Amino acid sequence: GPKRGAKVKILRKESYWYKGTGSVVAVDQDPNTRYPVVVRFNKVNYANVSTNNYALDEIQEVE
Amino acid sequence: DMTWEGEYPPSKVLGPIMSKMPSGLLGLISIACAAVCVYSIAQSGVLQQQPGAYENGSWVKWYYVLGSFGGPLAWGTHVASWIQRKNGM
Amino acid sequence: DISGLTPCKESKQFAKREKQALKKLQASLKLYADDSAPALAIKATMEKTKKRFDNYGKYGLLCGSDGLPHLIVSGDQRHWGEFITPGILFLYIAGWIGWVGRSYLIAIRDEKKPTQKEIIIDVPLASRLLFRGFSWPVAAYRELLNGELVDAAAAAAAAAAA
Amino acid sequence: MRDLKTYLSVAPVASTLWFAALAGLLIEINRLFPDALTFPF
Amino acid sequence: ATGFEEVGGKPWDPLSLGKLEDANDTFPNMFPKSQYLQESEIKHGRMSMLAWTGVWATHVGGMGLGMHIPGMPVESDWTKALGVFAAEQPALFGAILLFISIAEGESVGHSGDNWRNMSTKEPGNLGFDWMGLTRKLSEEQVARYKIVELKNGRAAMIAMASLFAMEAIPGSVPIMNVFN
Amino acid sequence: TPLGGEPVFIGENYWDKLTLEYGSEATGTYLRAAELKHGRSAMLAVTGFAFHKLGLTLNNISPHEYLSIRDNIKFADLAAMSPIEAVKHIPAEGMAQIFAAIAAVEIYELTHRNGKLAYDESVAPGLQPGGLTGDLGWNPLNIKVTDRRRLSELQNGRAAMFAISAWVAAEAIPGSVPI
Numbered sequence: 283g284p285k286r287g288a289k290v291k292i293l294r295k296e297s298y299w300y301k302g303t304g305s306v307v308a309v310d311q312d313p314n315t316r317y318p319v320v321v322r323f324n325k326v327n328y329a330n331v332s333t334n335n336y337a338l339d340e341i342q343e344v345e
Numbered sequence: 346d347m348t349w350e351g352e353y354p355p356s357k358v359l360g361p362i363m364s365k366m367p368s369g370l371l372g373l374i375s376i377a378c379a380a381v382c383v384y385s386i387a388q389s390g391v392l393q394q395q396p397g398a399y400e401n402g403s404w405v406k407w408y409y410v411l412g413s414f415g416g417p418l419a420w421g422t423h424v425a426s427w428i429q430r431k432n433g434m
Numbered sequence: 435d436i437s438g439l440t441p442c443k444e445s446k447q448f449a450k451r452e453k454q455a456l457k458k459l460q461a462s463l464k465l466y467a468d469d470s471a472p473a474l475a476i477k478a479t480m481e482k483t484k485k486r487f488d489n490y491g492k493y494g495l496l497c498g499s500d501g502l503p504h505l506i507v508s509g510d511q512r513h514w515g516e517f518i519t520p521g522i523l524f525l526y527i528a529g530w531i532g533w534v535g536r537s538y539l540i541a542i543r544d545e546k547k548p549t550q551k552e553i554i555i556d557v558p559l560a561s562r563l564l565f566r567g568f569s570w571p572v573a574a575y576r577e578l579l580n581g582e583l584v585d586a587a588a589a590a591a592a593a594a595a596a
Numbered sequence: 597m598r599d600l601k602t603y604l605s606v607a608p609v610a611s612t613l614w615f616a617a618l619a620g621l622l623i624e625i626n627r628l629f630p631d632a633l634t635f636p637f
Numbered sequence: 638a639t640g641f642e643e644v645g646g647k648p649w650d651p652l653s654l655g656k657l658e659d660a661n662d663t664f665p666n667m668f669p670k671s672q673y674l675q676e677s678e679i680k681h682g683r684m685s686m687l688a689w690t691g692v693w694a695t696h697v698g699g700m701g702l703g704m705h706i707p708g709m710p711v712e713s714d715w716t717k718a719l720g721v722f723a724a725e726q727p728a729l730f731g732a733i734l735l736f737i738s739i740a741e742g743e744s745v746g747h748s749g750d751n752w753r754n755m756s757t758k759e760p761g762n763l764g765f766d767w768m769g770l771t772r773k774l775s776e777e778q779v780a781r782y783k784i785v786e787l788k789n790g791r792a793a794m795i796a797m798a799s800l801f802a803m804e805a806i807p808g809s810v811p812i813m814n815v816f817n
Numbered sequence: 818t819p820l821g822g823e824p825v826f827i828g829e830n831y832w833d834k835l836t837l838e839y840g841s842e843a844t845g846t847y848l849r850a851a852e853l854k855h856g857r858s859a860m861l862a863v864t865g866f867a868f869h870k871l872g873l874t875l876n877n878i879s880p881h882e883y884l885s886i887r888d889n890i891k892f893a894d895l896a897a898m899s900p901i902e903a904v905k906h907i908p909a910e911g912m913a914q915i916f917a918a919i920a921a922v923e924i925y926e927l928t929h930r931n932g933k934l935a936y937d938e939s940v941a942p943g944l945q946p947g948g949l950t951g952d953l954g955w956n957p958l959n960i961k962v963t964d965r966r967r968l969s970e971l972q973n974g975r976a977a978m979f980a981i982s983a984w985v986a987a988e989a990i991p992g993s994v995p996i
């Protein structure tokens with residue numbers, strides 16, 4: 283998976299940032315959380331929101 | 346069953362009569378069909394040109410029309426021959 | 435000629451248009467005294483008008499039965515000055531702008547605030563970029579066969595459908 | 597006066613200067629070489 | 638010996654036309670693969686070596702050749718010599734065109750897709766090694782005569798481009814204004 | 818520090834004023850190169866003139882005397898109107914051809930540095946300091962390249978130059994000595 287500060291690609295299809303890149307900020311270590319990973323972005327969506335929570339199978343790592 | 350994968354389609358697409366047949370016979374038949382179509386068209390053109398043979402649609406002949414219809418047959422046969430050759434037949 | 439058109443130097447109706455356009459300005463000229471500003475302005479207008487008809491007569495344009503010039507865009511090389519030669523000219527200037535403007539966005543993208551430099555232009559940087567588009571057909575061609583012109587399919591966001 | 601220069605670099609000021617220079621570009625060329633329907637000149 | 642002796646020993650692809658079809662993902666199979674480009678160059682070369690020699694052997698006077706098969710039509714220039722022959726000899730013209738049509742169709746009918754690197758044949762390999770050459774020669778000579786065929790194909794393609802340009806642009810190639 | 822001068826007597830004089838004060842060692846090479854070029858040119862010219870005066874032209878020496886091959890330019894007519902008034906009767910086509918060969922040679926002397934042309938450079942190889950030594954390398958069946966050959970060649974060059982200059986002058990106007 284990612285770590286803090288990793289650059290990932292969103293694989294969720296209904297996300298605003300599908301096929302788009304961005305930076306992991308916090309990964310919740312508690313596995314009861316379904317979407318443990320805070321990923322931040324530099325471009326806003328239609329509701330002017332800059333971040334979102336994701337699962338580990340929904341993000342890809344770029345290098 | 347019809348859907349196919351790879352470079353060439355299976356023999357079954359040609360039909361029951363065509364699949365059984367060898368590539369060589371099909372190619373020869375296609376060439377014959379092509380020859381018949383061209384000759385018939387040329388003959389029809391000559392008849393159209395000729396005086397006393399073109400009046401009141403007299404130029405049209407049943408056999409020449411059959412050859413003209415046969416041009417499409419020549420194309421199909423050649424395609425079938427290629428498929429047969431591909432299926433090692 | 436093409437479409438049953440006649441050249442403008444040999445059109446009887448193109449010549450009548452020239453006369454009636456001059457007659458209209460002469461009948462307006464007669465109401466003024468010869469040294470005054472309205473008489474010098476209309477005299478200069480009839481020179482401009484007379485030079486406009488002379489220019490077309492030798493131009494090599496085609497006229498119709500209406501007496502007006504027509505343009506041929508089949509691709510004939512004999513009527514190139516009508517569409518091809520001003521066409522190649524526009525393509526050079528339009529592709530120059532699009533190329534230069536794109537260079538700017540790509541340049542200020544790698545930055546803290548790219549949006550700041552789109553409302554408030556970095557002019558020294560912009561001025562430099564504007565004149566580098568004089569050889570764009572070579573620069574747009576180097577990036578096509580590099581990989582830096584078009585992005586990959588996994589980099590564009592797409593609507594849920596596809 | 598580095599703040600007036602940033603004011604002169606804002607997009608609407610640059611747009612009117614650029615257009616003013618470009619409209620007057622076209623007006624001047626149409627003043628010396630008028631009525632150019634095509635290259636014939 | 639390498640084919641690159643006149644361009645500096647390196648592959649002459651300015652304008653990168655062989656790298657296209659691989660630079661981008663955006664036209665899926667719309668540009669030719671290396672195998673198809675290699676057969677096109679051999680084929681354009683072989684048609685140009687025959688056609689130059691044809692217009693050179695039938696030119697009468699000048700430097701010229703003026704050689705002429707008895708019974709065929711006397712025509713001065715090569716520009717109209719096809720359509721005169723097509724009208725006057727239908728049976729001979731139809732048999733040549735059928736021979737060209739079958740052999741050119743057989744080139745691709747037994748092998749795979751050429752446009753995509755799926756052919757399973759060497760480019761230029763038509764089954765015409767009747768003399769039994771390359772079965773008697775060694776590998777250094779066989780690889781050499783391929784390059785000989787290539788550059789002579791390339792000299793004739795530029796020749797045919799000169800021969801086209803002199804009749805569309807009357808002052809284009811000046812070495813032929815004089816040569817006639 | 819140049820090559821051998823006059824054999825009977827030597828004198829460099831006007832050489833240290835440009836290859837030390839005005840120019841340098843690079844100018845020395847250039848000067849020599851120019852000298853050699855001129856020498857060779859003069860030699861060829863001399864031979865041509867000699868042949869023309871003598872009479873050994875196409876009509877006398879071969880089966881072909883029709884140079885124009887369309888402009889009706891025979892060799893007999895060109896051999897009866899001297900040497901200076903014959904070069905002006907040469908057809909434009911021919912002139913173009915000649916200019917071509919010379920141009921090619923000059924370009925080679927400019928691009929092809931050593932064995933092969935240089936694909937990337939700020940300027941041409943011969944346009945740099947010491948770009949053209951004088952020797953093109955053209956030595957077919959080369960008999961020798963010693964220290965005597967060079968000197969001999971140079972001497973024949975200047976002599977040829979003087980000779981042809983004098984010849985031209987005399988055809989044009991009263992010279993001085995006999996021919």
Ligand code: CLA
Nearest residue numbers: 526527530531534535563564565566567568611614618622
């Ligand atoms: C309304 C119509 C219109 C027209 C006609 C133009 C026309 C032009 N625009 Mg503009 N523009 C327009 C609207 C228009 N624009 C609009 C609506 C916008 C959006 C706001 C723009 C945005 C814009 C930008 C950002 C730029 C332009 C630029 C240009 C110029 C590009 C071509 C050039 O620079 O000269 C042609 C120049 C050459 C052909 C030089 C050739 C190359 C040299 C090296 C050759 C040298 C030859 C030598 C000197 C000859 C002498 C030899 C001697 C013996 C005779 C051109 C004058 C560019 C510009 O101004 O250039 C700095 C530029 O950056 N435009």
Ligand code: CLA
Nearest residue numbers: 642643644645646921922924925929932933934953954955
């Ligand atoms: C006009 C006379 C002339 C001559 C003699 C040559 C000769 C040569 N050319 Mg050039 N060339 C010419 C004109 C000429 N060119 C013109 C007009 C053009 C177009 C502008 C070119 C364009 C060109 C290209 C693009 C290339 C060459 C190449 C070559 C060389 C072959 C490559 C090699 O490895 O050999 C090297 C030679 C040796 C190792 C042997 C050296 C021995 C010396 C003495 C050379 C032979 C004598 C000399 C060539 C004779 C000239 C004297 C003259 C009075 C006849 C060869 C030396 C290729 C090259 O050199 O680079 C790889 C090459 O790529 N030529």
Ligand code: CLA
Nearest residue numbers: 376379382383386387416419727728729731732734735738
């Ligand atoms: C490549 C094969 C081929 C083709 C295309 C032709 C075509 C033609 N021949 Mg010809 N011929 C051939 C082979 C061929 N022949 C052979 C092998 C011989 C024996 C040596 C002859 C002997 C011959 C004689 C003796 C005469 C002709 C004539 C003609 C013309 C017919 C009259 C007319 O106006 O056309 C009518 C229009 C058409 C033919 C076009 C119809 C095309 C349609 C769309 C169908 C496509 C054809 C077919 C299905 C495809 C062929 C496949 C092939 C590649 C295997 C025509 C141009 C006669 C003529 O008028 O001379 C000029 C004539 O007197 N030919």
Ligand code: CLA
Nearest residue numbers: 372423424425426427428430738739741742743745746747
């Ligand atoms: C679209 C029509 C079409 C199709 C699908 C085929 C298909 C085939 N032909 Mg065939 N052929 C055609 C037209 C066609 N042909 C025509 C018009 C002629 C000339 C009379 C021939 C002459 C011919 C010969 C002589 C041979 C084949 C052979 C073959 C087979 C494989 C090798 C090959 O394709 O090389 C042949 C390549 C071509 C003929 C290229 C020309 C293709 C046409 C003219 C282009 C038009 C297509 C266009 C995009 C359609 C637009 C759609 C609409 C707007 C109309 C294959 C089954 C070979 C065979 O039997 O297999 C071993 C063979 O030897 N063909």
Ligand code: CLA
Nearest residue numbers: 819821822823828829831832848849851852855975978979
């Ligand atoms: C264009 C041809 C040309 C060139 C470039 C040179 C160049 C050179 N010669 Mg030279 N030379 C020439 C023709 C030429 N010569 C002729 C025809 C003769 C026979 C008279 C000589 C006889 C000669 C001798 C005997 C020696 C040289 C030497 C030298 C070298 C040193 C002298 C110097 O600095 O330049 C000389 C000056 C110039 C080239 C200036 C150019 C002249 C001006 C611009 C115009 C003069 C026009 C003039 C009126 C023409 C009429 C002829 C004259 C005799 C009146 C130098 C490389 C010496 C050497 O190799 O080093 C020691 C040497 O020993 N030359």
Ligand code: CLA
Nearest residue numbers: 857860952953954955956959960961962966967969970973
């Ligand atoms: C007296 C005249 C003379 C002498 C001594 C030389 C000597 C030399 N030249 Mg040279 N050259 C000359 C005249 C001369 N040349 C002329 C007139 C030209 C212009 C066409 C050239 C063009 C030339 C080039 C282009 C190059 C040389 C080079 C060389 C050097 C070595 C290679 C070579 O060819 O040897 C030449 C060997 C001899 C001259 C001895 C043989 C005796 C001669 C051939 C008798 C000539 C008679 C007659 C003209 C031939 C026609 C036959 C007739 C009898 C029926 C050598 C120092 C090369 C160089 O500088 O590399 C270091 C070089 O690249 N020369």
Ligand SMILES: CC(=O)O[C@H]1CC(C)(C)C(=C=C/C(C)=C/C=C/C(C)=C/C=C/C=C(C)/C=C/C=C(\C)C(=O)C[C@@]23O[C@]2(C)C[C@@H](O)CC3(C)C)[C@](C)(O)C1
Nearest residue numbers: 369370372373375376379413414416417419420423426739
């Ligand atoms: C024993 C053996 O091995 O044999 C070998 C021999 C040989 C030669 C080596 C081989 C080969 C190659 C072969 C056989 C190649 C054959 C190629 C072939 C035969 C290609 C035809 C195309 C026909 C077309 C396009 C028809 C168009 C027809 C059209 C477009 C029409 O619209 C016709 C029509 O409009 C008219 C004109 C007007 C109307 O009146 C009728 C209508 C409207 C319908 C083989 C395969 O290896 C086998």
Ligand SMILES: CC(=O)O[C@H]1CC(C)(C)C(=C=C/C(C)=C/C=C/C(C)=C/C=C/C=C(C)/C=C/C=C(\C)C(=O)C[C@@]23O[C@]2(C)C[C@@H](O)CC3(C)C)[C@](C)(O)C1
Nearest residue numbers: 686687690691736740741743747757758762763764765766
């Ligand atoms: C200048 C001038 O005047 O000259 C004249 C004369 C000249 C040059 C002759 C002229 C001509 C006519 C020409 C060029 C005619 C060309 C005809 C042509 C090109 C005819 C191909 C047939 C191919 C066949 C039958 C292939 C069979 C292929 C076979 C049988 C195989 O199975 C091959 C096999 O390979 C595998 C797959 C693997 C190998 O392990 C084993 C083998 C090898 C067995 C001109 C144009 O008129 C000019």
